[PDB]
């Protein structure tokens, strides 16, 4: 466990994280993909061996001794708002189980379903709130990675509002 488990946000490539494991915003088929998934494929390509897993699940594959947790958020282009919301909640619950199983003291995590899988909507608050519901009961340091300057500000304010 971390000595005083914390949330932090950084605006940078998750492939340069300083944490003990990474969460990939994966597709269900274990393909190289785009955005976070493409950066993760370039940095840890060995982790894509048998990484296919269903929507709403997470599957960990080791790159050497470094764990890559492939977490599959719903594509809101295909899911109803209702079903998509349930699968996005479920994907983060499976990340919390894997983080706990691995015994890591820190994890790098992107906001699932907020890019190509967003169905054209702003899902910062929806995705971040499902991240908190899952990770609040874990004692790993959680470092959230984003690329937009306005998103960094809003994530930081959300963390600070809980004090
Ligand atoms: N590689 C990343 O950290 C990243 C890339 C995109 Cl396009 C969006 C969010 C991210 N965290
Ligand atoms: Cl960067
Ligand atoms: Cl996405
Ligand atoms: Cl972002």
From Swiss-Prot:
Localization terms from the record: Host cytoplasmic vesicle membrane
Residues noted as binding ADP-D-ribose in the record, renumbered to the chain: 13, 27, 35, 115-117
Function: Seems to be essential for minus-strand RNAs and subgenomic 26S mRNAs synthesis. Displays mono-ADP-ribosylhydrolase activity. ADP-ribosylation is a post-translational modification that controls various processes of the host cell and the virus probably needs to revert it for optimal viral replication. Binds proteins of G3BP family and sequesters them into the viral RNA replication complexes thereby inhibiting the formation of host stress granules on viral mRNAs.
Oligomeric and partner information: Interacts with mRNA-capping enzyme nsP1. Interacts (via C-terminus) with host G3BP1; this interaction inhibits the formation of host stress granules on viral mRNAs and the nsp3-G3BP1 complexes bind viral RNAs and probably orchestrate the assembly of viral replication complexes. Interacts (via C-terminus) with host G3BP2; this interaction inhibits the formation of host stress granules on viral mRNAs and the nsp3-G3BP2 complexes bind viral RNAs and probably orchestrate the assembly of viral replication complexes. Interacts (via C-terminus) with host NAP1L1.
The protein, known as: Non-structural protein 3
Result after altering residue 36 to A: Partial loss of mono-ADP-ribosylhydrolase activity
Free-text note regarding domains: In the N-terminus, the macro domain displays a mono-ADP-ribosylhydrolase activity. The central part called, the alphavirus unique domain (AUD) has a zinc-binding function. The C-terminus region, also called hypervariable domain (HVD), is mainly disordered and binds several host proteins. This intrinsically disordered domain contains 2 SH3 domain-binding sites and 2 FGDF motifs necessary and sufficient for the formation of nsP3/G3BP complexes.
Domain Macro: residue ranges: 4-163
Outcome of mutating residue 13 to A: Partial loss of ADP-ribose 1'' phosphate phosphatase activity
Effect of residue 117 to V/W: Almost complete loss of mono-ADP-ribosylhydrolase activity
Membrane topology summary: Peripheral membrane protein
Post-translational modification: Phosphorylated by host on serines and threonines.
